[PDB]
Amino acid sequence: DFEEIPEEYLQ
Amino acid sequence: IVEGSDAEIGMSPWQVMLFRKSPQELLCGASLISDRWVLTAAHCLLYPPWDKNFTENDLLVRIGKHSRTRYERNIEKISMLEKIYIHPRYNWRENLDRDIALMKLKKPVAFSDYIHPVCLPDRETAASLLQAGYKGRVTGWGNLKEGQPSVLQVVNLPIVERPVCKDSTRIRITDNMFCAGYKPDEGKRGDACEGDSGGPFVMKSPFNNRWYQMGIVSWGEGCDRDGKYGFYTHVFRLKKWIQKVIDQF
Amino acid sequence: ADCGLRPLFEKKSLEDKTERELLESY
Ligand SMILES: N=C(N)NOCCNC(=O)Cc1c(Cl)ccc(NCC(F)(F)c2ccccc2)c1F
């Protein structure tokens, strides 16, 4: 449902 | 938000989205009160009856948003949390009394057309504006009915008299709460709902034209039921704790 | 210090669509 956010934040 | 409207761009530049890392989802609303402090509801982070207990690392705050699901490139900012502070006397066992939490951002965020802090009420602003019949404004990406909006929703709701709030529920109401919404016989509707929690209830001062955050979306029973009302954390009553946390940490 | 004043509204002296409703209740 949600658009992926940049990988760096998922850190 | 139930029975609300699409917000205009930049209408609530203090609106913050609490975003779970994984699974990626919307947790709650929140509000920006300075360049690195974010105000929200405690139950958004800590609620043992539902095995909910998030930490600094489970969460992201996304600021300056309008679309609920899109990654708003060059517009929104995403921040990590350094520390979370829950009110010591937050009462999750009984009635969500003192439903409030502060979050310190890893790094200060830069303001823009879409990102700007709301004011916290002083004693006099609170005294003058927190009255039955005055209207405040609630915003969030929460459920549309007791299904989910594409953009931020807004609804204006009147403050309700204390006796009426009390007689509408079996839950024990405290001075740290107020309720808001239309009466069954007023013809207009609207309420916050699941997903809106932690969001701001704001009012515009007729004296200095500034927006002040009077409440935090806390709880209710269902959403937008006749003869029921939304309950909000009374921000000013808890301001001493807010101020204390800030100038200490 | 600059709290509660929106870049796209108060700062430009533009009103949003429903703020009048708030003011009229006070
Ligand atoms: N304005 C609204 N229409 N809702 O407000 C935003 C949605 N917020 C919540 O869903 C949080 C919440 C939680 Cl965590 C637990 C219970 C309830 N409601 C049940 C109860 F009302 F019975 C109750 C109240 C407080 C303590 C124990 C039980 C509750 F609303």
Beta bridge partners of B216: B200, B233
Which DSSP category does C14 fall into?
P
Minimum CA distance residue for ligand 1 atom 22:
B221
At A11, list the tokens. Answer: 């850190």
Alpha-carbon distance of B130 to B16, in angstroms, equals: 23
Whether C contacts B, i.e. 3 or more CB pairs less than 8 A apart, is yes
| Chain C residues near any Cβ of chain B (below 8 Å) | 2-10, 16-19, 21-23, 25-26
* CB < 8 Å from B in window 1-11 of A: 1-6, 9-10
Alpha-carbon distance of B180 to B202, in angstroms, equals: 12
Mapped onto helix, strand or coil, the DSSP state of residue B114 is coil
Count the domains in chain C. Answer: 1
Q: From the CA of B57, how many Å to the nearest CA of chain A?
A: 9
Count the domains in chain B. Answer: 2
> Are both B78 and B24 inside the same structural domain?
yes
Alpha-carbon distance of B144 to B151, in angstroms, equals: 11
> Are both B132 and B90 inside the same structural domain?
no
The boundaries of the domain holding residue C19 are 1-26
Partner residue opposite C25 with nearest CB, options B8, B9, B158: B158
> Are both B18 and B126 inside the same structural domain?
no
Computed on alpha carbons and rounded to an integer, the radius of gyration of chain A in Å comes to: 7
Q: Do B71 and A4 count as a contact with CB atoms less than 8 A apart?
A: yes
> Are both B97 and B126 inside the same structural domain?
no
| DSSP E strand boundaries for C1-26 | none
Alpha-carbon distance of B29 to B117, in angstroms, equals: 14
Beta bridge partners of B231: B179, B219
Centre of ligand 1 from the C-alpha of residue B180, in Å: 14
Partner residue opposite B69 with nearest CB, options A2, A9, A10: A2
Spell out the residues 6+ positions from residue B233 whose beta carbon is closer than 8 angstroms to its own: B41, B98, B99, B100, B176, B177, B215, B216, B218
Q: Do B67 and B227 touch, CB atoms closer than 8 A?
A: no
Alpha-carbon distance of B52 to B142, in angstroms, equals: 18
> Are both B154 and B230 inside the same structural domain?
yes
Q: Do B200 and B213 touch, CB atoms closer than 8 A?
A: yes
Method: X-ray
> Are both B3 and B80 inside the same structural domain?
no
Q: What is the CATH number of the domain that holds B249?
A: 2.40.10.10
Q: Do B103 and B83 touch, CB atoms closer than 8 A?
A: yes
> Are both B125 and B105 inside the same structural domain?
no
Q: What is the CATH number of the domain that holds C9?
A: 4.10.140.10
Resolution for this experimental structure (Å): 2.1
Closest CA to B230 of B216, B245, B247, B244: B216
Alpha-carbon distance of B149 to B136, in angstroms, equals: 21
Closest CA to B27 of B101, B110, B106, B121: B101
Mapped onto helix, strand or coil, the DSSP state of residue B42 is helix
Alpha-carbon distance of B71 to B59, in angstroms, equals: 16
> Are both B194 and B231 inside the same structural domain?
yes
Alpha-carbon distance values, B151 to B87, B142, B158, B237 (Å): 31, 10, 23, 32
The boundaries of the domain holding residue B167 are 1-12+118-236
Which DSSP category does B13 fall into?
T
Give phi and psi for B245, each to the nearest 5. Answer: -55, -40
> Are both B154 and B84 inside the same structural domain?
no
Q: Do B232 and B218 touch, CB atoms closer than 8 A?
A: yes
Closest CA to B68 of B31, B8, B25, B5: B25
